[PDB]
Design a protein that fits this description.
The structure is a homodimer.
Chain A lengths: L1 E6 L3 E6 L6 H11 L7 E5 L2 E2 L6 H4 L5 E7 L5
Parallel strand pairs in A: 1-5
Antiparallel strand pairs in A: 1-2, 3-4, 3-5
Subcellular location (chain B): Cytoplasm; Nucleus; Mitochondrion outer membrane
Protein name (chain B): Ubiquitin
Membrane topology (chain B): Peripheral membrane protein
């Protein structure tokens, strides 16, 4: 089922995610298509900035979900 | 006001910086001085890596402050 992870300036990562899916697994599915490693991926979804080892169900991530992706040191 | 932007790799970049300096403005002065372009640089203060458009005044990076520059 699809999620729309939106990387800052508009780079929208369309991902096919599982009914079993997990957040470091979703980070691996981004580390494919976008090439971004897991520290450099800071996800944000519904009240929460996201971690690494959680499920999609934990955060309430479902079909056609907009997540946001923040890229590490966004400057500095 | 004088700060010491070190690298971990030996070097000390001694800079006269402003209270108005944002980090990319300091990175531009490091580009001038040592030839390094902006988002190749990452500034550490103590053990925290910095955000961009925040000032040296915001971070409390005053005179004699040792920063650590890494590249990534």
């Amino acid at each position: 089922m699809q999620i729309f992870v939106k990387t800052l300036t508009g780079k929208t990562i369309t991902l096919e995610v599982e009914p079993s899916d997990t957040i470091e697994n979703v980070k691996a599915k981004i580390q494919d298509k976008e090439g971004i490693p897991p520290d450099q991926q800071r996800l944000i979804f519904a009240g929460k900035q996201l971690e690494d080892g959680r499920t999609l169900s934990d955060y309430n991530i479902q079909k056609e979900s907009t997540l946001h992706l923040v890229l590490r040191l966004r400057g500095g």
